[PDB]
Amino acid sequence: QRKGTDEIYGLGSLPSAGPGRWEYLANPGNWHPERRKLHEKLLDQARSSALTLAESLESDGCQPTLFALRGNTATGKTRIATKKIPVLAAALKKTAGKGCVNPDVFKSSLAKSETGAKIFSSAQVHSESSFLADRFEGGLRSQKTGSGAIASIVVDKRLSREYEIDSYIQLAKETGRKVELCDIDAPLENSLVGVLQRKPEGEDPRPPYPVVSSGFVAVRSNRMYVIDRFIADPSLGNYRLFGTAEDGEKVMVASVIGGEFSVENAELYEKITSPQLSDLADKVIDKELIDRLENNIADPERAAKTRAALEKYSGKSWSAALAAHSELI
Amino acid sequence: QRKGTDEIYGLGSLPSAGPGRWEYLANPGNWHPERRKLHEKLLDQARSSALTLAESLESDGCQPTLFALRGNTATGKTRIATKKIPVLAAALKKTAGKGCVNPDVFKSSLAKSETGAKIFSSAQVHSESSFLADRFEGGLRSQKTGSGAIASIVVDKRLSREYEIDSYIQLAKETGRKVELCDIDAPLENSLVGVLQRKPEGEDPRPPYPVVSSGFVAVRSNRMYVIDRFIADPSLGNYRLFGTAEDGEKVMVASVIGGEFSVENAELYEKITSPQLSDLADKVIDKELIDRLENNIADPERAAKTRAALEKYSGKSWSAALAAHSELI
Amino acid sequence: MKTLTGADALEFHKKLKERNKALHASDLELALVHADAVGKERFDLEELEKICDTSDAGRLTDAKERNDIYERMYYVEYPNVMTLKEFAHIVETLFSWS
Amino acid sequence: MKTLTGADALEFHKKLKERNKALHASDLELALVHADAVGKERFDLEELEKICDTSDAGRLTDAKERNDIYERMYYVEYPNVMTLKEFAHIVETLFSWS
């Protein structure tokens, strides 16, 4: 059955890629009316959440800002925002985390299709969800709050690649927003562990291994380019890079704050700016690996959840385990 | 009491370094007659062993050769010679391993001082033993066998540094010997484990951590220079590099044989030509580390000996453990 | 440890950029030598683009970035993938996710 | 895996030499920046040679090798050693062994 929802609910034939496929999807007449209406409903919800965020941020005296949370999958981005961006943490509590620009915001809703249960896989709904995230981000560009001020917005994508970074900088410049960027790094194995801990009944995506590994390579390789942008332009906004110590705790590694560049942890800075190409896909999850990962987790709850996630795939390679874990609905 | 034997048994005051201290030691009148006689006796033994090696090698049809076993401490050099240099293995069995040029050949004898028990530390006898190794190597230079042919010799030092490599190449050229070089690599942790396994009642040295770590850095950093010498000069002799797989087995990584250069394992070649500066000195030997090292050893006997060596220093850093292990007499 | 600031921070950053740029170029150069030795199919963007979209649905337009991304991933990240077809599979997977 | 031979082996070797040379230089450059930031005593061979023998008892005579060996070990291998005195200790240890 594995055609994507864009095929199932699109009317007529699907043009194949930009700018063919793209514009076909933008025209509502190209969808069954039920899907069209579902699109309208999800965008309304997402836009209301974003406005709530933007109003909280303005009331707390924040000038128009693009908050960008850069970093690979499952690196600990949600916790960094809660702890290290107090004004955003206050906004997010009011929406229970909703309202951010993220190509995965619409996936669960689209996968359930208002039927009360998930019937499409993440991969089946991805293109449709990304199409929606694009419409959502498009309308936020010139979104105003109740004071007529430009609305602050939150983008939490991987933001690995140079062209992605450039586009959000250009968006911010064009729309009069500061860029407030936190860049969050974890070892690849941490992301793999983090992904295996995400339960199918939860909303967080469960990507297979190559997504996580290629995401890790890209985020590391293109990190210094991002830092260069803030060093070069003090008026861009502020940058903070957080890396993960041996014990799992996040620590600040480098920062550009007030146009001032500092390296809080030069050892980590050298490490987390390169992909360290030595591979992990074939490494087998066995007792030793699990014991090794437990050895560096002190929190009882996390240690227990980490263990359970891994034990489920005991004897499997990282690749096979994330594959199996990804295929669950 | 920790003056070296050169001080204790040297007559008069000790000049401080080259060429002062050096030449003082070369004059027998500068030693107590008992020590002088002990020197003569040890050199006689070492020279008889070397002649036995050289005669075995010639009878087996080996042209005048300098066999050089390059590599850091406890990397598995003895096993490589036994398995991978069959003509040398046959010579060595006839001398039970004796006869090689090695700055540690005389240490145990000098430490016991014919008293029947070890009373000086390795460090107390080092300079005297190195002085003797120098006299021993000096007399081998133009040593002939019974056919008047130049005697083949074995040098098993670390041979890390460029100047060391150059000097042995020059020795070989000057004395009409081929160079047959095996270069043996192990991960640093392997050498550390290997050193902790060496028992004080055995003859192999038990150096402290910085010796092993600096030896590892030097051997790796200067490896390609050595390979370059064989690539550049097919008549120099032959070169083989052996590295250590994940399971502990040695495998050939690169070779220059018959002036022909090949890379049998390019992944290992990239790895074992650099010191991988990420440190280990402070890493604590705990249950997890021991379990990790046991996990990659399948031979029951080695697994057991590895475990016992490490358990003795459970809770100590690598540095503290090798320090304590080194200080035993 | 002590935070690097001012001139030292900037100089650490400059030298680290040089190191990583040298490693970046080296990883690809070595991968290419190895690829030729094992007979891995030569990377061809145009032919790859004729089984998948290398634009991120129009996001990535700079062809010199498009080339660098996929050529380098093909050689450096998937040295054991031998053919453009097989790599096709991978890129498809990557764009099925975020 | 497949053995690299002929032209490919030589080219792998050439590029790997370049990579390692770039890493070699980089390790020292970064160590120097860090050393200046923490106030680690400037390396001085002459003054070091005035507490230990840097010749290997006359083996190492090439002063440009003598400098490279100890300067680099001081900065790259012992970044936490702050003084020439303390490093003195280390070199003494190294020549007590083989």
Short mmCIF file of all heavy atoms in Angstrom, two decimals, chain A residues 36 116 133 139 195 204 206 261 266 310:
data_model
loop_
_atom_site.label_atom_id
_atom_site.label_comp_id
_atom_site.label_asym_id
_atom_site.label_seq_id
_atom_site.Cartn_x
_atom_site.Cartn_y
_atom_site.Cartn_z
N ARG A 36 -7.96 18.49 1.74
CA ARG A 36 -7.87 19.95 1.67
C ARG A 36 -8.30 20.55 3.00
O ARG A 36 -7.63 21.42 3.55
CB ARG A 36 -8.81 20.42 0.55
CG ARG A 36 -8.52 21.77 -0.06
CD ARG A 36 -9.54 22.07 -1.18
NE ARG A 36 -9.56 21.02 -2.21
CZ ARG A 36 -10.64 20.68 -2.91
NH1 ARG A 36 -11.80 21.29 -2.72
NH2 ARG A 36 -10.55 19.71 -3.82
N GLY A 116 -8.64 8.29 14.29
CA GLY A 116 -8.46 7.85 15.66
C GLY A 116 -7.32 6.89 15.89
O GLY A 116 -7.05 6.49 17.03
N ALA A 133 4.57 22.05 6.40
CA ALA A 133 5.52 22.80 7.21
C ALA A 133 5.99 23.99 6.40
O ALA A 133 6.21 25.07 6.94
CB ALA A 133 6.70 21.92 7.62
N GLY A 139 3.73 31.44 6.02
CA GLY A 139 2.82 32.40 6.63
C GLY A 139 3.35 33.04 7.91
O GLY A 139 2.84 34.07 8.35
N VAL A 195 17.28 7.67 19.75
CA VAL A 195 16.25 7.26 18.80
C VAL A 195 15.57 5.95 19.21
O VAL A 195 14.34 5.81 19.11
CB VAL A 195 16.81 7.19 17.39
CG1 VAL A 195 15.91 6.33 16.48
CG2 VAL A 195 16.96 8.61 16.82
N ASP A 204 7.63 11.72 18.60
CA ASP A 204 8.96 11.95 18.02
C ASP A 204 9.30 10.92 16.94
O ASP A 204 9.00 9.73 17.09
CB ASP A 204 10.04 11.99 19.11
CG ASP A 204 10.02 13.28 19.92
OD1 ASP A 204 9.54 14.32 19.40
OD2 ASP A 204 10.49 13.25 21.08
N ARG A 206 11.13 8.26 14.46
CA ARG A 206 12.05 7.14 14.64
C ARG A 206 12.74 6.83 13.30
O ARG A 206 12.40 5.85 12.65
CB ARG A 206 11.28 5.92 15.17
CG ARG A 206 10.86 6.06 16.64
CD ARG A 206 9.69 5.14 17.03
NE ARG A 206 8.45 5.48 16.34
CZ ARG A 206 7.92 4.75 15.35
NH1 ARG A 206 8.54 3.64 14.95
NH2 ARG A 206 6.78 5.12 14.77
N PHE A 261 33.50 36.46 20.62
CA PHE A 261 33.72 35.02 20.43
C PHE A 261 34.61 34.40 21.51
O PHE A 261 35.72 34.89 21.79
CB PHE A 261 34.29 34.75 19.04
CG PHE A 261 34.65 33.32 18.81
CD1 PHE A 261 33.66 32.34 18.76
CD2 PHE A 261 35.97 32.96 18.62
CE1 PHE A 261 33.99 31.03 18.53
CE2 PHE A 261 36.31 31.64 18.41
CZ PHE A 261 35.32 30.67 18.36
N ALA A 266 37.90 24.05 24.67
CA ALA A 266 38.62 23.88 23.42
C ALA A 266 38.81 22.42 23.01
O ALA A 266 38.83 22.11 21.82
CB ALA A 266 39.98 24.60 23.49
N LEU A 310 17.74 -0.61 24.56
CA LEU A 310 18.81 -1.39 23.93
C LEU A 310 18.59 -2.89 24.05
O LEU A 310 18.85 -3.63 23.10
CB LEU A 310 20.17 -1.04 24.56
CG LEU A 310 20.63 0.42 24.49
CD1 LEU A 310 21.89 0.63 25.33
CD2 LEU A 310 20.89 0.79 23.06
#
